[PDB]
C-alpha cells in the first residue's frame, strides 16, 4: 500500500517554477500546488530522483519514511508525496525555505553574520542532531550544503539522502558498497572500517563548525585544505590513503581566520580519533548556548 496519502498532492496541479538544487542522483525544484487554479496555491519544494533505478527508488522510499517520522523546529518539514506518472513514480513534497542552503547564504550574507550568529546556527544544527539520535538515525552527510535557511534566525537540516537507521543491537551501521562519499567530512573509522555512528556524525559536525567559521571563503573548504596538505597533484585512491594517514596522526583542518580559540577547541574535540571520547550533541548544544549566553560586549 502507498506509504502516504496519494490524493493529497495530485501531479496535474503540481506546477514547476524553478530548479533549486541538483546532484547526480536527485534534484529539488520549487513548485506551486494550485488545486483550485486560483490564488489559493502554496509554493513547495519537491525532491525527485535523477538517473533512477530500482535500488535508488527503494532507498528514496526509506528516505521519505525517515523525513516523515521527524518533527522538529530544526528539521525541514515533510508535507507529503506526489505519486506521479499515474502512481508509478514518487516525488517528495517539503516546505520551501526561502533563503536556500546555508553554504550559499553564508557567502551571500557574510557581511551581516558575526560569531554569535554562527553560534546560533551551530546550536540549531546540534539540536536537530540530538533529535535525530533519539530515533537512532545516523545522518552521514552533515555539511553546510545540506542545511537550509528559513530566515535570519532559523536554520534546518534539509536533506536525509544518506541517512541510515541503526540496527537494533548495535551502535554503528556498517556500509557495504558506498555511493557518494563526502570523504573530507568523514570520521577516520568511516574511512577505515565503513562504520557510521552518532559519534561519526559528531566528527562531521566539527567539520560543519569549521565550514561556518570560514564563511565558505575561496580555498578554505575542507576539500581544498585537505588537498593542499596531502598534495594537489595526487589523484585517485592515493588521496584516500594519504587522508587516512593524515588523520590517524593528528593532521587537522586549520583554525579559520578570525576564529576564537575556544571555538577551534570545540572542533578539535569533535575530531577525536577515540570515538567514545567525542562529545555528545547534547554536550555541544549546551556548551555553544552557554558561550552565546555569556557574550554581551
Ligand atoms: C544534491 C542532491 S539534491 O539536489 O536533491 N540536494 C538537496 C539540496 C541540499 C539540501 N538541503 N537542496 C535542497 C534544497 C531546498 N531549497 C529550498 N529553498 C531554496 C530557496 C532559494 C534558493 C536560491 C537562493 C539563492 N540562489 C542564489 C538562488 C535561489 C535555493 F537554492 C533553495 N527549500 C527546500 N526545502 C526542502 C529542500 C529545499 C536546495 N538544495 C541539494
UniProtKB/Swiss-Prot annotation:
Modification after translation (UniProt): Autophosphorylated, leading to regulate its activity. Autophosphorylation on Tyr-33, Tyr-131 and Tyr-137 in response to growth hormone (GH) are required for maximal kinase activity. Also phosphorylated by TEC. Phosphorylated on tyrosine residues in response to interferon gamma signaling. Phosphorylated on tyrosine residues in response to a signaling cascade that is activated by increased cellular retinol.
Domain Protein kinase: 14-289
Protein's cellular compartments: Endomembrane system; Cytoplasm; Nucleus
Residues noted as binding ATP in the record, renumbered to the chain: 20-28, 47
The organism's place on the tree of life at top rank: Eukaryota
Residues modified to Phosphotyrosine: 33, 131, 137, 172-173
Entry comment describing in which tissues the protein is expressed: Ubiquitously expressed throughout most tissues.
Active site: 141 (proton acceptor)
UniProt similarity note: Belongs to the protein kinase superfamily. Tyr protein kinase family. JAK subfamily.
Disease: Chromosomal aberrations involving JAK2 are found in both chronic and acute forms of eosinophilic, lymphoblastic and myeloid leukemia. Translocation t(8;9)(p22;p24) with PCM1 links the protein kinase domain of JAK2 to the major portion of PCM1. Translocation t(9;12)(p24;p13) with ETV6. Budd-Chiari syndrome: A syndrome caused by obstruction of hepatic venous outflow involving either the hepatic veins or the terminal segment of the inferior vena cava. Obstructions are generally caused by thrombosis and lead to hepatic congestion and ischemic necrosis. Clinical manifestations observed in the majority of patients include hepatomegaly, right upper quadrant pain and abdominal ascites.
Protein function: Non-receptor tyrosine kinase involved in various processes such as cell growth, development, differentiation or histone modifications. Mediates essential signaling events in both innate and adaptive immunity. In the cytoplasm, plays a pivotal role in signal transduction via its association with type I receptors such as growth hormone (GHR), prolactin (PRLR), leptin (LEPR), erythropoietin (EPOR), thrombopoietin receptor (MPL/TPOR); or type II receptors including IFN-alpha, IFN-beta, IFN-gamma and multiple interleukins.
Comment text on domains: Possesses 2 protein kinase domains. The second one probably contains the catalytic domain, while the presence of slight differences suggest a different role for protein kinase 1.
Quaternary structure, from the entry: Interacts with EPOR, LYN, SIRPA, SH2B1 and TEC. Interacts with IL23R. Interacts with SKB1. Interacts with STAM2. Interacts with IFNGR2 (via intracellular domain). Interacts with LEPR (Isoform B). Interacts with HSP90AB1; promotes functional activation in a heat shock-dependent manner. Interacts with STRA6. Interacts with RHEX; this interaction occurs in a erythropoietin (EPO)-dependent manner. Interacts with ASB2; the interaction targets JAK2 for Notch-induced proteasomal degradation. Interacts with MPL/TPOR.
Protein name in UniProt: Tyrosine-protein kinase JAK2
Gene (name only): JAK2
Amino acid at each position: 500500500a502507498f506509504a502516504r496519502d496519494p490524493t493529497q498532492f495530485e501531479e496535474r496541479h503540481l506546477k514547476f517554477l524553478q530548479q533549486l538544487g541538483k546532484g547526480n542522483f536527485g534534484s529539488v525544484e520549487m513548485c506551486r500546488y494550485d488545486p483550485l487554479q486560483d490564488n489559493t496555491g502554496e509554493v513547495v519544494a519537491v525532491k525527485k530522483l535523477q538517473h533512477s533505478t530500482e535500488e535508488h527508488l527503494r532507498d528514496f522510499e526509506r528516505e521519505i519514511e525517515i523525513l516523515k517520522s521527524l518533527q522538529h523546529d530544526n528539521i525541514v518539514k515533510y508535507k507529503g508525496v506526489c505519486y506521479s506518472a499515474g502512481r508509478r513514480n514518487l516525488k517528495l513534497i517539503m516546505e520551501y525555505l526561502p533563503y536556500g542552503s546555508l553554504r550559499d547564504y553564508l557567502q551571500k550574507h557574510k557581511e551581516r553574520i558575526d560569531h554569535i550568529k554562527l553560534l546560533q546556527y551551530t546550536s540549531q544544527i546540534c539540536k536537530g542532531m540530538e533529535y535525530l539520535g533519539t530515533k537512532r538515525y545516523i545522518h552521514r552527510d552533515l555539511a553546510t550544503r545540506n542545511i537550509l535557511v528559513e530566515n535570519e534566525n532559523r536554520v534546518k537540516i534539509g536533506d536525509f539522502g544518506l541517512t541510515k537507521v541503526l540496527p537494533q543491537d548495535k551502535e554503528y551501521y556498517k556500509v557495504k558498497e558506498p555511493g557518494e562519499s563526502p570523504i573530507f567530512w568523514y570520521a577516520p573509522e568511516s574511512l577505515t572500517e565503513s562504520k557510521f555512528s552518532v559519534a561519526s556524525d559528531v566528527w562531521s559536525f566539527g567539520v560543519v563548525l569549521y565550514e561556518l567559521f570560514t564563511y565558505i571563503e575561496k580555498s578554505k573548504s575542507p576539500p581544498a585544505e585537505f588537498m593542499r596538505m596531502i598534495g594537489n597533484d595526487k589523484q585517485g585512491q592515493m588521496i584516500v590513503f594519504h587522508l587516512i594517514e593524515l588523520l590517524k596522526n593528528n593532521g587537522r583542518l586549520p583554525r579559520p581566520d578570525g576564529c576564537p580559540d575556544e571555538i577551534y577547541m570545540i572542533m578539535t574535540e569533535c575530531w577525536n580519533n577515540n570515538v567514545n571520547q567525542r562529545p555528545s550533541f547534547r554536550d555541544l548544544a549546551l556548551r555553544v548556548d552557554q558561550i552565546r549566553d555569556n557574550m554581551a560586549g
